[PDB]
Amino acid sequence: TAGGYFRQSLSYLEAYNPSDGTWLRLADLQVPRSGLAGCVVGGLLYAVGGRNNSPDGNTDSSALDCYNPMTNQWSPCAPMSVPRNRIGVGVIDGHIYAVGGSHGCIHHNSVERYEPERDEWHLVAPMLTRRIGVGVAVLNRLLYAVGGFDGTNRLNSAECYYPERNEWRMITAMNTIRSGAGVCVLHNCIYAAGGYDGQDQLNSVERYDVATATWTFVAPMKHRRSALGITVHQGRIYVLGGYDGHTFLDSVECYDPDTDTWSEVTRMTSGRSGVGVAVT
Ligand SMILES: O=C(O)CCc1ccc(O)cc1
């Protein structure tokens, strides 16, 4: 987990061990950020976009920054073409897709691709929808923009990116309006967890099966949370932090699919929301 928000933007980089339950402190971000996404290419942990909320400013980020796990050092990579706060990212065969996000009052539908060994960015097909707080996930080498906020409406729609065809295709919408949901793939179906619908923070969770183009609910999380971090470790889903309408959780819940149950597995070292997350 990289970055996050609690009273201001965070530089924290911490790792959770689901075996012994403890948390490992690691090298701070060069620049604090909330509303960023995390991802892994070549075993390297990347932190994309976001925003530095502090008592001195609120600047959206175009930064891309790389952390080496054996080296514990951050390096500047090329910036995106535009700042993207509340971004979604997905990895397709070692490439970085930066999706949506905001810059001030501007709500991006644009998408951009980064080449890790070549350190370059280029724009591609824009989404059909302007999406802030978009969940992004890759399933069967296909990219999914899920949920989010267009500036007026929070979204239950979802659209799919075809790399080779470089086109966006709307798909079946979710049952539930979700902005700032945690979105990932677990088993072989896209999971969208929690989020915010313009009125409430959500605990419901729903999964999309490609072969039936259908969304189905599963067990809700224990705690309603938007701006949660999401990733998949040892065949299970992990939700981290987020906001519930009253407090910034350190609560971490773990979904068991076999039973279809969630359980709180740890507390973060400090309550927070809006982190970037990836796994090694
Ligand atoms: O729709 C929202 O306004 C944008 C995304 C967003 C959702 C929840 C949250 O706590 C922070 C950000």
Tab-separated table of C-alpha atoms and ligand atoms in Angstrom:
chain	number	residue	atom	x	y	z
A	1	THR	CA	0.000	0.000	0.000
A	2	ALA	CA	1.338	3.379	-1.185
A	3	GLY	CA	0.029	6.778	-0.160
A	4	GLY	CA	-3.459	7.550	1.091
A	5	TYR	CA	-5.350	10.239	2.969
A	6	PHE	CA	-5.843	11.007	6.630
A	7	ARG	CA	-6.334	14.716	7.407
A	8	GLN	CA	-3.797	15.262	4.565
A	9	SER	CA	-2.132	13.282	1.798
A	10	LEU	CA	0.230	10.567	3.030
A	11	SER	CA	3.680	9.363	1.979
A	12	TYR	CA	3.335	6.042	3.847
A	13	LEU	CA	4.527	2.822	2.229
A	14	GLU	CA	3.580	-0.222	4.305
A	15	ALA	CA	3.217	-3.956	3.653
A	16	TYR	CA	0.869	-6.434	5.373
A	17	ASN	CA	1.753	-10.057	6.166
A	18	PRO	CA	-1.478	-12.132	6.271
A	19	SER	CA	0.505	-15.010	7.842
A	20	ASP	CA	1.874	-13.392	11.022
A	21	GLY	CA	-0.513	-10.388	10.962
A	22	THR	CA	2.172	-7.684	11.313
A	23	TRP	CA	2.903	-4.545	9.262
A	24	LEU	CA	6.313	-3.575	7.797
A	25	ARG	CA	7.295	0.118	7.502
A	26	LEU	CA	9.107	1.057	4.254
A	27	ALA	CA	10.429	4.061	2.297
A	28	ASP	CA	8.159	7.118	2.097
A	29	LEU	CA	6.888	8.416	-1.225
A	30	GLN	CA	8.908	11.293	-2.617
A	31	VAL	CA	5.668	13.324	-2.776
A	32	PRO	CA	2.539	12.617	-0.651
A	33	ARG	CA	-0.501	11.472	-2.601
A	34	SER	CA	-4.092	10.361	-2.097
A	35	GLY	CA	-6.422	9.130	-4.809
A	36	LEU	CA	-3.599	7.263	-6.556
A	37	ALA	CA	-3.488	3.720	-7.914
A	38	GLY	CA	-0.764	1.104	-7.438
A	39	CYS	CA	0.455	-1.598	-9.820
A	40	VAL	CA	3.357	-3.992	-10.480
A	41	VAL	CA	5.414	-4.445	-13.641
A	42	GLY	CA	8.552	-6.587	-13.603
A	43	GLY	CA	8.102	-7.072	-9.882
A	44	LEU	CA	8.465	-3.290	-9.478
A	45	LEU	CA	5.802	-1.348	-7.574
A	46	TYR	CA	4.477	1.737	-9.373
A	47	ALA	CA	2.446	4.652	-8.000
A	48	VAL	CA	0.355	6.607	-10.530
A	49	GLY	CA	-1.443	9.957	-10.398
A	50	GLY	CA	-3.297	11.175	-7.338
A	51	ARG	CA	-3.267	14.475	-5.451
A	52	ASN	CA	-1.341	16.202	-2.640
A	53	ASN	CA	-3.906	17.520	-0.175
A	54	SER	CA	-2.080	19.561	2.487
A	55	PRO	CA	-2.707	22.846	4.346
A	56	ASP	CA	-0.487	24.511	1.688
A	57	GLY	CA	-2.020	23.253	-1.528
A	58	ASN	CA	-4.067	20.673	-3.369
A	59	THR	CA	-2.226	19.592	-6.510
A	60	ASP	CA	-3.283	16.739	-8.752
A	61	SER	CA	-0.531	14.401	-9.816
A	62	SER	CA	0.685	13.295	-13.218
A	63	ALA	CA	3.713	11.701	-11.585
A	64	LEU	CA	4.692	8.083	-12.184
A	65	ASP	CA	7.117	6.760	-9.596
A	66	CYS	CA	8.854	3.401	-9.186
A	67	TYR	CA	9.808	1.489	-6.026
A	68	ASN	CA	12.296	-1.401	-6.128
A	69	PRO	CA	11.532	-3.998	-3.411
A	70	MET	CA	15.120	-5.213	-2.945
A	71	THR	CA	16.395	-1.625	-3.157
A	72	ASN	CA	13.793	0.355	-1.128
A	73	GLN	CA	14.306	3.360	-3.451
A	74	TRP	CA	11.877	5.523	-5.420
A	75	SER	CA	12.751	6.787	-8.886
A	76	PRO	CA	10.938	9.337	-11.058
A	77	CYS	CA	9.517	7.866	-14.236
A	78	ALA	CA	7.955	9.920	-16.986
A	79	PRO	CA	4.886	11.972	-16.018
A	80	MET	CA	1.510	11.305	-17.603
A	81	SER	CA	0.207	13.725	-20.202
A	82	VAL	CA	-2.364	15.105	-17.730
A	83	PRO	CA	-2.812	15.007	-13.921
A	84	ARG	CA	-5.158	12.228	-12.775
A	85	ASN	CA	-6.611	12.319	-9.275
A	86	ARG	CA	-8.753	9.296	-8.279
A	87	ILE	CA	-7.271	7.198	-11.058
A	88	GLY	CA	-7.646	3.615	-12.183
A	89	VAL	CA	-4.810	1.513	-13.571
A	90	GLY	CA	-4.487	-1.920	-15.098
A	91	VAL	CA	-1.577	-4.017	-16.317
A	92	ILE	CA	-1.858	-5.847	-19.654
A	93	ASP	CA	1.232	-7.968	-20.416
A	94	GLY	CA	3.593	-5.587	-18.650
A	95	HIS	CA	2.111	-2.258	-19.792
A	96	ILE	CA	0.601	0.490	-17.624
A	97	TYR	CA	-2.822	1.948	-18.432
A	98	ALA	CA	-3.836	5.169	-16.686
A	99	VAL	CA	-7.597	5.652	-16.789
A	100	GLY	CA	-9.865	8.571	-16.027
A	101	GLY	CA	-9.217	10.641	-12.948
A	102	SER	CA	-9.624	14.349	-12.483
A	103	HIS	CA	-7.670	17.580	-12.820
A	104	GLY	CA	-9.522	20.370	-11.091
A	105	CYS	CA	-12.996	20.543	-12.555
A	106	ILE	CA	-11.906	18.428	-15.528
A	107	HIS	CA	-13.166	14.853	-15.487
A	108	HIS	CA	-11.040	12.692	-17.734
A	109	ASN	CA	-12.312	10.106	-20.100
A	110	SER	CA	-8.826	9.909	-21.635
A	111	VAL	CA	-6.603	6.852	-21.181
A	112	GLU	CA	-2.802	6.644	-21.486
A	113	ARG	CA	-0.297	3.804	-21.812
A	114	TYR	CA	3.187	3.572	-20.286
A	115	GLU	CA	6.081	1.320	-21.361
A	116	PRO	CA	8.237	0.400	-18.311
A	117	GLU	CA	11.474	-0.537	-20.090
A	118	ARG	CA	11.033	2.405	-22.512
A	119	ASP	CA	9.699	4.986	-19.980
A	120	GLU	CA	7.177	6.711	-22.296
A	121	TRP	CA	3.492	7.750	-22.244
A	122	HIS	CA	0.993	8.002	-25.122
A	123	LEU	CA	-2.742	8.642	-25.335
A	124	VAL	CA	-5.095	5.961	-26.669
A	125	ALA	CA	-8.844	5.576	-27.109
A	126	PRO	CA	-10.901	7.694	-24.691
A	127	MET	CA	-13.503	5.921	-22.563
A	128	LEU	CA	-17.150	6.438	-23.521
A	129	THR	CA	-17.649	8.008	-20.087
A	130	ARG	CA	-15.869	10.592	-18.002
A	131	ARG	CA	-14.909	8.652	-14.855
A	132	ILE	CA	-13.318	9.819	-11.590
A	133	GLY	CA	-12.945	7.223	-8.884
A	134	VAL	CA	-12.963	4.471	-11.527
A	135	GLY	CA	-12.117	0.897	-10.639
A	136	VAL	CA	-9.921	-0.728	-13.266
A	137	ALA	CA	-9.110	-4.410	-13.736
A	138	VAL	CA	-7.736	-6.797	-16.361
A	139	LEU	CA	-9.449	-10.131	-17.064
A	140	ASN	CA	-8.517	-12.288	-20.082
A	141	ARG	CA	-6.142	-9.581	-21.378
A	142	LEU	CA	-9.072	-7.128	-21.449
A	143	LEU	CA	-9.285	-3.826	-19.554
A	144	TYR	CA	-12.365	-2.850	-17.523
A	145	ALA	CA	-13.371	0.629	-16.369
A	146	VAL	CA	-15.953	0.177	-13.612
A	147	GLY	CA	-18.088	2.691	-11.735
A	148	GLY	CA	-16.840	6.140	-10.887
A	149	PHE	CA	-18.085	9.733	-11.092
A	150	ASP	CA	-18.582	11.890	-14.214
A	151	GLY	CA	-18.924	15.232	-12.396
A	152	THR	CA	-22.661	14.979	-11.837
A	153	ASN	CA	-23.649	11.336	-11.695
A	154	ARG	CA	-22.016	8.444	-9.934
A	155	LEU	CA	-21.909	5.431	-12.208
A	156	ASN	CA	-22.985	1.790	-12.244
A	157	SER	CA	-21.831	1.412	-15.840
A	158	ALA	CA	-18.753	-0.469	-16.904
A	159	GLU	CA	-16.877	-0.477	-20.167
A	160	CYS	CA	-14.209	-2.718	-21.644
A	161	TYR	CA	-10.987	-1.838	-23.432
A	162	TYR	CA	-9.730	-4.042	-26.248
A	163	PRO	CA	-5.975	-3.370	-26.644
A	164	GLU	CA	-5.435	-4.793	-30.129
A	165	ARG	CA	-8.658	-3.212	-31.398
A	166	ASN	CA	-8.072	0.020	-29.379
A	167	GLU	CA	-11.785	0.530	-28.771
A	168	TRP	CA	-14.114	0.900	-25.790
A	169	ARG	CA	-17.227	-1.249	-25.462
A	170	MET	CA	-19.898	-0.674	-22.844
A	171	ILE	CA	-20.920	-3.804	-20.953
A	172	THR	CA	-23.633	-4.825	-18.500
A	173	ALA	CA	-23.888	-2.265	-15.729
A	174	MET	CA	-23.541	-3.151	-12.075
A	175	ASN	CA	-26.619	-3.438	-9.920
A	176	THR	CA	-25.223	-0.715	-7.628
A	177	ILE	CA	-23.945	2.814	-8.272
A	178	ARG	CA	-20.271	2.824	-7.202
A	179	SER	CA	-17.734	5.636	-7.081
A	180	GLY	CA	-14.428	4.931	-5.402
A	181	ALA	CA	-15.116	1.221	-5.213
A	182	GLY	CA	-12.296	-1.271	-4.908
A	183	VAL	CA	-12.130	-3.223	-8.156
A	184	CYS	CA	-10.027	-6.316	-8.944
A	185	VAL	CA	-10.215	-9.836	-10.386
A	186	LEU	CA	-10.574	-12.821	-8.033
A	187	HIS	CA	-11.071	-16.294	-9.463
A	188	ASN	CA	-11.956	-15.302	-12.991
A	189	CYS	CA	-14.685	-12.709	-12.469
A	190	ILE	CA	-14.376	-8.950	-11.946
A	191	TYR	CA	-15.078	-7.917	-8.365
A	192	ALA	CA	-16.294	-4.443	-7.415
A	193	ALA	CA	-16.427	-3.810	-3.665
A	194	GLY	CA	-17.940	-0.953	-1.707
A	195	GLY	CA	-17.824	2.589	-3.017
A	196	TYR	CA	-20.011	5.653	-2.782
A	197	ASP	CA	-23.280	6.262	-4.614
A	198	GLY	CA	-23.781	9.971	-3.958
A	199	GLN	CA	-25.663	9.262	-0.714
A	200	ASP	CA	-24.081	6.345	1.175
A	201	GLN	CA	-20.838	4.475	1.505
A	202	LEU	CA	-21.312	0.858	0.496
A	203	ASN	CA	-20.533	-2.540	1.932
A	204	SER	CA	-22.178	-4.633	-0.790
A	205	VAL	CA	-19.911	-6.497	-3.190
A	206	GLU	CA	-20.701	-7.825	-6.619
A	207	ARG	CA	-18.921	-9.950	-9.159
A	208	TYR	CA	-19.121	-9.956	-12.949
A	209	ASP	CA	-18.988	-13.244	-14.908
A	210	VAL	CA	-17.867	-12.614	-18.490
A	211	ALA	CA	-19.454	-15.687	-20.108
A	212	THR	CA	-22.931	-14.670	-18.894
A	213	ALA	CA	-22.375	-10.871	-18.923
A	214	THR	CA	-23.975	-10.929	-15.491
A	215	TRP	CA	-23.295	-9.225	-12.158
A	216	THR	CA	-24.077	-11.165	-8.991
A	217	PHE	CA	-23.866	-10.060	-5.377
A	218	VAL	CA	-21.750	-11.911	-2.815
A	219	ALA	CA	-21.364	-11.481	0.929
A	220	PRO	CA	-21.099	-7.795	1.896
A	221	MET	CA	-18.031	-6.532	3.680
A	222	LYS	CA	-18.454	-5.875	7.388
A	223	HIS	CA	-17.765	-2.119	7.120
A	224	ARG	CA	-19.102	0.278	4.497
A	225	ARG	CA	-16.163	1.946	2.775
A	226	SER	CA	-15.418	4.114	-0.245
A	227	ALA	CA	-11.950	4.973	-1.557
A	228	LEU	CA	-10.772	1.550	-0.401
A	229	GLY	CA	-7.632	-0.154	-1.594
A	230	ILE	CA	-8.030	-3.496	-3.325
A	231	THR	CA	-5.704	-6.282	-4.429
A	232	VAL	CA	-5.544	-10.080	-4.726
A	233	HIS	CA	-3.080	-12.089	-2.588
A	234	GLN	CA	-3.026	-15.905	-2.384
A	235	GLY	CA	-6.332	-16.292	-4.183
A	236	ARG	CA	-8.218	-13.944	-1.832
A	237	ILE	CA	-9.497	-10.340	-1.878
A	238	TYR	CA	-8.123	-7.710	0.510
A	239	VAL	CA	-9.878	-4.376	1.212
A	240	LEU	CA	-7.784	-1.709	2.967
A	241	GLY	CA	-8.902	1.446	4.746
A	242	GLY	CA	-11.373	3.779	3.087
A	243	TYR	CA	-13.984	6.147	4.459
A	244	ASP	CA	-17.424	5.281	5.867
A	245	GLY	CA	-19.166	8.625	6.325
A	246	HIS	CA	-17.675	9.107	9.776
A	247	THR	CA	-14.101	7.830	10.160
A	248	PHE	CA	-11.054	6.793	8.151
A	249	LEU	CA	-10.742	3.063	8.708
A	250	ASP	CA	-7.612	1.138	9.466
A	251	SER	CA	-9.864	-1.918	9.320
A	252	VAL	CA	-8.734	-4.547	6.829
A	253	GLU	CA	-11.293	-7.165	5.801
A	254	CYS	CA	-10.589	-10.400	3.949
A	255	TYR	CA	-13.136	-12.186	1.780
A	256	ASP	CA	-13.240	-15.956	1.763
A	257	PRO	CA	-14.949	-16.995	-1.479
A	258	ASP	CA	-15.289	-20.656	-0.478
A	259	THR	CA	-17.594	-19.732	2.395
A	260	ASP	CA	-18.576	-16.340	0.932
A	261	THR	CA	-17.638	-14.515	4.127
A	262	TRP	CA	-15.578	-11.478	5.092
A	263	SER	CA	-13.544	-11.200	8.274
A	264	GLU	CA	-11.402	-8.419	9.700
A	265	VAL	CA	-7.815	-9.618	9.580
A	266	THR	CA	-5.801	-6.649	10.904
A	267	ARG	CA	-5.823	-2.931	11.549
A	268	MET	CA	-3.656	-0.626	9.499
A	269	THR	CA	-0.997	1.208	11.493
A	270	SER	CA	-3.194	4.289	10.972
A	271	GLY	CA	-6.661	4.786	9.555
A	272	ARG	CA	-6.594	6.057	5.992
A	273	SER	CA	-8.364	6.121	2.641
A	274	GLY	CA	-7.464	6.529	-1.009
A	275	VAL	CA	-4.309	4.419	-1.147
A	276	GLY	CA	-2.658	2.733	-4.099
A	277	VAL	CA	-2.135	-1.019	-3.755
A	278	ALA	CA	-0.275	-3.836	-5.516
A	279	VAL	CA	1.266	-7.132	-4.448
A	280	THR	CA	4.644	-8.828	-4.238
B	1	LIG	O1	-17.713	10.622	-6.300
B	1	LIG	C1	-16.829	11.072	-5.522
B	1	LIG	O2	-17.128	12.304	-5.436
B	1	LIG	C2	-15.429	10.878	-6.121
B	1	LIG	C3	-14.748	9.562	-5.714
B	1	LIG	C4	-14.670	9.390	-4.203
B	1	LIG	C5	-15.550	8.532	-3.546
B	1	LIG	C6	-15.490	8.389	-2.164
B	1	LIG	C7	-14.531	9.093	-1.443
B	1	LIG	O3	-14.447	8.953	-0.054
B	1	LIG	C8	-13.645	9.941	-2.100
B	1	LIG	C9	-13.716	10.091	-3.478
